[PDB]
Design a protein around this motif. Structure first.
Motif, PDB file in Angstrom:
ATOM      1  N   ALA A 107     -72.666-107.456  44.859  1.00  0.00           N
ATOM      2  CA  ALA A 107     -71.091-107.633  44.569  1.00  0.00           C
ATOM      3  C   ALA A 107     -70.371-106.930  45.542  1.00  0.00           C
ATOM      4  O   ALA A 107     -69.142-107.551  45.786  1.00  0.00           O
ATOM      5  CB  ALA A 107     -70.861-106.933  43.134  1.00  0.00           C
ATOM      6  N   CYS A 108     -70.756-105.945  46.236  1.00  0.00           N
ATOM      7  CA  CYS A 108     -69.942-104.924  46.839  1.00  0.00           C
ATOM      8  C   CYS A 108     -69.519-105.624  48.347  1.00  0.00           C
ATOM      9  O   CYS A 108     -68.238-105.225  48.913  1.00  0.00           O
ATOM     10  CB  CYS A 108     -70.585-103.542  47.212  1.00  0.00           C
ATOM     11  SG  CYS A 108     -70.746-102.754  45.638  1.00  0.00           S
ATOM     12  N   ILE A 109     -70.137-106.254  48.890  1.00  0.00           N
ATOM     13  CA  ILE A 109     -69.771-107.002  50.148  1.00  0.00           C
ATOM     14  C   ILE A 109     -68.659-107.963  49.935  1.00  0.00           C
ATOM     15  O   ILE A 109     -67.303-107.699  50.533  1.00  0.00           O
ATOM     16  CB  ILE A 109     -70.736-107.332  51.122  1.00  0.00           C
ATOM     17  CG1 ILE A 109     -71.652-106.438  51.605  1.00  0.00           C
ATOM     18  CG2 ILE A 109     -70.213-108.320  52.124  1.00  0.00           C
ATOM     19  CD1 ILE A 109     -72.886-106.677  52.710  1.00  0.00           C
ATOM     20  N   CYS A 167     -66.729-108.180  47.421  1.00  0.00           N
ATOM     21  CA  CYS A 167     -65.559-107.380  46.791  1.00  0.00           C
ATOM     22  C   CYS A 167     -64.647-106.287  47.827  1.00  0.00           C
ATOM     23  O   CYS A 167     -63.367-106.375  47.649  1.00  0.00           O
ATOM     24  CB  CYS A 167     -65.983-105.967  45.846  1.00  0.00           C
ATOM     25  SG  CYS A 167     -64.835-105.417  44.978  1.00  0.00           S
ATOM     26  N   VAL A 168     -65.337-105.952  48.852  1.00  0.00           N
ATOM     27  CA  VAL A 168     -64.899-105.190  49.818  1.00  0.00           C
ATOM     28  C   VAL A 168     -64.032-106.348  50.688  1.00  0.00           C
ATOM     29  O   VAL A 168     -63.086-105.959  51.363  1.00  0.00           O
ATOM     30  CB  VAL A 168     -65.374-104.055  50.813  1.00  0.00           C
ATOM     31  CG1 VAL A 168     -66.049-103.086  50.086  1.00  0.00           C
ATOM     32  CG2 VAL A 168     -66.415-104.773  51.579  1.00  0.00           C
ATOM     33  N   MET A 169     -64.486-107.587  50.917  1.00  0.00           N
ATOM     34  CA  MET A 169     -63.804-108.587  51.650  1.00  0.00           C
ATOM     35  C   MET A 169     -62.417-108.992  51.186  1.00  0.00           C
ATOM     36  O   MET A 169     -61.306-109.130  51.714  1.00  0.00           O
ATOM     37  CB  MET A 169     -64.482-109.740  52.191  1.00  0.00           C
ATOM     38  CG  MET A 169     -65.291-109.138  53.080  1.00  0.00           C
ATOM     39  SD  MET A 169     -66.640-110.677  53.404  1.00  0.00           S
ATOM     40  CE  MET A 169     -68.219-109.718  54.245  1.00  0.00           C
ATOM     41  N   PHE A 205     -72.996 -99.841  38.265  1.00  0.00           N
ATOM     42  CA  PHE A 205     -73.001-100.895  37.400  1.00  0.00           C
ATOM     43  C   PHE A 205     -73.041-102.676  37.801  1.00  0.00           C
ATOM     44  O   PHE A 205     -73.447-103.309  36.814  1.00  0.00           O
ATOM     45  CB  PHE A 205     -72.098-100.575  35.998  1.00  0.00           C
ATOM     46  CG  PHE A 205     -72.244 -99.757  35.233  1.00  0.00           C
ATOM     47  CD1 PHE A 205     -72.401 -98.417  35.628  1.00  0.00           C
ATOM     48  CD2 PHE A 205     -72.858-100.020  33.764  1.00  0.00           C
ATOM     49  CE1 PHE A 205     -72.466 -97.351  34.616  1.00  0.00           C
ATOM     50  CE2 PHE A 205     -73.424 -98.715  32.997  1.00  0.00           C
ATOM     51  CZ  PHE A 205     -72.967 -97.634  33.240  1.00  0.00           C
ATOM     52  N   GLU A 206     -72.465-102.904  39.132  1.00  0.00           N
ATOM     53  CA  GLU A 206     -72.455-104.080  39.393  1.00  0.00           C
ATOM     54  C   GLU A 206     -73.576-104.662  39.857  1.00  0.00           C
ATOM     55  O   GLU A 206     -74.522-104.147  40.188  1.00  0.00           O
ATOM     56  CB  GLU A 206     -71.314-104.039  40.365  1.00  0.00           C
ATOM     57  CG  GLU A 206     -69.837-103.446  40.088  1.00  0.00           C
ATOM     58  CD  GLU A 206     -69.193-104.170  38.975  1.00  0.00           C
ATOM     59  OE1 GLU A 206     -69.561-105.246  38.433  1.00  0.00           O
ATOM     60  OE2 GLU A 206     -68.043-103.298  38.440  1.00  0.00           O
ATOM     61  N   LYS A 207     -73.715-106.159  39.844  1.00  0.00           N
ATOM     62  CA  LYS A 207     -74.799-106.805  40.296  1.00  0.00           C
ATOM     63  C   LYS A 207     -74.866-106.287  41.899  1.00  0.00           C
ATOM     64  O   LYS A 207     -73.889-106.067  42.361  1.00  0.00           O
ATOM     65  CB  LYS A 207     -74.568-108.439  40.261  1.00  0.00           C
ATOM     66  CG  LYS A 207     -74.536-109.080  38.790  1.00  0.00           C
ATOM     67  CD  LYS A 207     -74.974-110.349  38.658  1.00  0.00           C
ATOM     68  CE  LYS A 207     -73.732-111.297  39.106  1.00  0.00           C
ATOM     69  NZ  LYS A 207     -74.288-112.693  39.124  1.00  0.00           N
TER      70      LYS A 207
HETATM   71  S1  FES Z   1     -67.682-103.606  42.973  1.00  0.00           S
HETATM   72 FE1  FES Z   1     -68.423-102.175  44.734  1.00  0.00          FE
HETATM   73  S2  FES Z   1     -66.650-102.510  46.238  1.00  0.00           S
HETATM   74 FE2  FES Z   1     -66.005-103.178  44.507  1.00  0.00          FE
END
Ligand code: FES
Ligand SMILES: C[C@H](CCC(=O)NCCC[N+](C)(C)C[C@@H](O)CS(=O)(=O)O)[C@H]1CC[C@H]2[C@@H]3[C@H](O)C[C@@H]4C[C@H](O)CC[C@]4(C)[C@H]3C[C@H](O)[C@]12C
Ligand SMILES: C[C@H](CCC(=O)NCCC[N+](C)(C)C[C@H](O)CS(=O)(=O)O)[C@H]1CC[C@H]2[C@@H]3[C@H](O)C[C@@H]4C[C@H](O)CC[C@]4(C)[C@H]3C[C@H](O)[C@]12C
Ligand SMILES: C[C@H](CCC(=O)NCCC[N+](C)(C)C[C@H](O)CS(=O)(=O)O)[C@H]1CC[C@H]2[C@@H]3[C@H](O)C[C@@H]4C[C@H](O)CC[C@]4(C)[C@H]3C[C@H](O)[C@]12C
Ligand SMILES: C[C@H](CCC(=O)NCCC[N+](C)(C)C[C@H](O)CS(=O)(=O)O)[C@H]1CC[C@H]2[C@@H]3[C@H](O)C[C@@H]4C[C@H](O)CC[C@]4(C)[C@H]3C[C@H](O)[C@]12C
Ligand SMILES: C[C@H](CCC(=O)NCCC[N+](C)(C)C[C@H](O)CS(=O)(=O)O)[C@H]1CC[C@H]2[C@@H]3[C@H](O)C[C@@H]4C[C@H](O)CC[C@]4(C)[C@H]3C[C@H](O)[C@]12C
Ligand SMILES: Nc1ncnc2c1ncn2[C@@H]1O[C@H](CSCC[C@H](N)C(=O)O)[C@@H](O)[C@H]1O
Ligand code: SF4
Ligand SMILES: [Cl-]
Ligand SMILES: [Cl-]
Ligand SMILES: [Cl-]
Length: 346
Positions: free
Chosen positions: A317-319, A321-323, A312-314
């Protein structure tokens, strides 16, 4: 004794009997001590760097019919997609712009791309001065060779289960023997080669899990991806039990103990079955994280299993977020490509 099993693990006496007892003991104290041992071994051998592998799930078309998988060919309920080669290259470029040092290309076994479109894509991504990992399933040796010549560095091909009878039932297009032949071929061609299994498959026993650990240790894989089985409602296994998070975590910990210098991800499936499951896994032996870099509107369609986090995220977002995750864990992002750095020992 739990105490005696830990001592044997510490002394590297990796007998069938030691591993079975480790997986069978349910005591909280023993489990915590095992997780601590794996965590320590991880720190000692591979350090505090958490390597970030940006994964682009570029097609959900598959020709196989694995009983566990939401992308199986018989699932008519799923909207199928394919990214163009230009889309894939540009999306990889954006991950590199965000600091990704490895790009992972993963798909269903989609004939459309194989082998030449993959080769073209790999060539373009390699220009960006990053590692490329492929996770495209089982293909002829000639395709793997072409991809290596194109510049692919690594290949992820989870072995799923080392029980050949279970494997053939769950994967009726193929066999454990085929899967192993693929893995051996990849190794021969000079790929950093990743294997790994699911935990909690229907009919899978503790002895099977032991066999998975011994198989991993035998072939000395560069990467090992382990996660729980998560039932998917549009598959034959819809009504089966999910894999146990703690048993899965014990598999990750023992993998670290057995293969101290390997690369071991905290898989998305671990984060899907328990909130915060990836972070726990990173503290029990894992040293790699694979943020989802599949673009909208396709993220939500790559449904190996349901509930998959991050969908559901943009889609950038995940790079970041993991940082943030890596910092709040007291860890550091990987500085180089995070290839396996062998520590030769006795
Ligand atoms: S939003 Fe995907 S790793 Fe956190
Ligand atoms: C955060 C959590 C609760 C801690 C707690 O709240 N204790 C009570 C408070 C403790 N102190 C230190 C903050 C203060 C106390 O000294 C004084 S007092 O309790 O306030 O009076 C503790 C309890 C058990 C811990 C896990 C296990 O080891 C296994 C494993 C080992 C690895 O290596 C690292 C990961 C794992 C998963 C650990 C993470 C974490 O570490 C856990 C979850
Ligand atoms: C120390 C702290 C305060 C206790 C108090 O109120 N005094 C209590 C309150 C909530 C407790 C955690 C949760 O239960 C989840 C989990 C259960 C596992 O079984 C053991 C680990 C976990 C992480 C626990 C650790 C610890 O026990 C916590 C932090
Ligand atoms: C892509 C974009 C425009 C400029 C550009 O194209 N740079 C290419 C940079 C290539 N690098 C990463 C190899 C350096 C630049 C401008 C600002 C950059 C972010 C911030 O710094 C914060 C943060 C730092 C982390 O470390 C990596 C993630 C973050 C979110 C960055 C990502 C990315 O980098 C951004 C969005
Ligand atoms: C709160 C949550 C339910 C929701 C349950 C489900 C899985 C549980 C963790 C695992 O068992 C592994 C580990 C065992 C240690 O003994 C204590 C810490 C750990 C991290 C546990 C904490 C907690 O109890 C979890 C997160
Ligand atoms: C932009 C985003 C908000 C924040 C959240 C966590 C931040 C990173 C961590 O602090 C560790 C490190 C310093 C550099 C690193 C990677 C940071 C970049 C950026 O500052 C981040 C991504
Ligand atoms: N229901 C489910 N629960 C947990 N993991 C699953 C799953 N379905 C598939 N997976 C995992 O997803 C991984 C990627 S499948 C995509 C790559 C390629 N088609 C291949 O099969 O290798 C698999 O290896 C499998 O271990
Ligand atoms: S696990 Fe891989 S090969 Fe099997 S159905 Fe899913 S995507 Fe296809
Ligand atoms: Cl990788
Ligand atoms: Cl993985
Ligand atoms: Cl996973």
């Amino acid at each position: 004794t739990g105490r005696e099993i830990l001592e044997k693990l510490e002394r590297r006496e990796f007998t069938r009997e030691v591993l079975k007892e480790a997986l069978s003991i349910n005591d909280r104290g023993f489990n915590e001590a095992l997780f601590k041992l794996a965590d320590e071994i991880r720190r000692k051998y591979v350090g505090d760097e958490v390597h970030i592998r940006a994964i682009i799930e570029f097609s959900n078309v598959c020709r196989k019919n694995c009983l566990y998988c939401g992308l199986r060919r018989d699932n008519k309920n799923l909207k199928r997609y394919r990214m163009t080669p230009e889309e894939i290259v540009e999306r990889a470029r954006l991950a590199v712009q965000f600091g990704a040092k490895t790009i992972v290309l993963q798909s269903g076994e989609d004939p459309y791309y194989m082998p030449d479109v993959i080769s073209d894509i790999v060539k373009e991504i390699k220009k960006m001065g990053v590692a490329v990992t492929l996770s495209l399933g089982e293909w002829p040796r000639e395709y793997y060779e072409k991809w290596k010549e194109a510049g692919a560095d690594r290949y992820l091909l989870r072995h799923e289960t080392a029980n050949p009878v279970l494997h053939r039932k769950l994967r009726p297009d193929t066999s454990f023997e085929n899967r192993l032949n693929c893995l051996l071929t990849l190794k021969e061609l000079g790929y950093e080669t990743g294997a790994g299994s699911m935990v909690g498959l229907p009919g899978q026993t503790i002895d099977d899990l032991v066999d998975d650990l011994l198989f991993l240790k035998e072939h000395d894989f560069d990467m090992v991806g382990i996660g729980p089985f998560i039932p998917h409602p549009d598959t034959p296994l819809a009504n089966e039990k999910k894999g146990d998070f703690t048993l899965t975590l014990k598999m990750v910990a023992l993998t670290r103990i057995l293969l101290p210098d390997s690369n071991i991800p905290a898989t998305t499936a671990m984060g899907t079955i328990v909130p915060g499951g990836r972070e726990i896994t990173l503290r029990c032996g894992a040293n790699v994280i694979m943020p989802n870099w599949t673009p909208s509107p396709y993220r939500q369609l790559y449904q190996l299993y349901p509930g998959k986090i991050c969908v559901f995220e943009k889609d950038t977002a995940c790079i970041p977020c993991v940082m943030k995750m890596i910092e709040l864990l007291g860890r550091k992002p990987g500085r180089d490509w995070g290839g396996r750095k062998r520590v030769f020992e006795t």
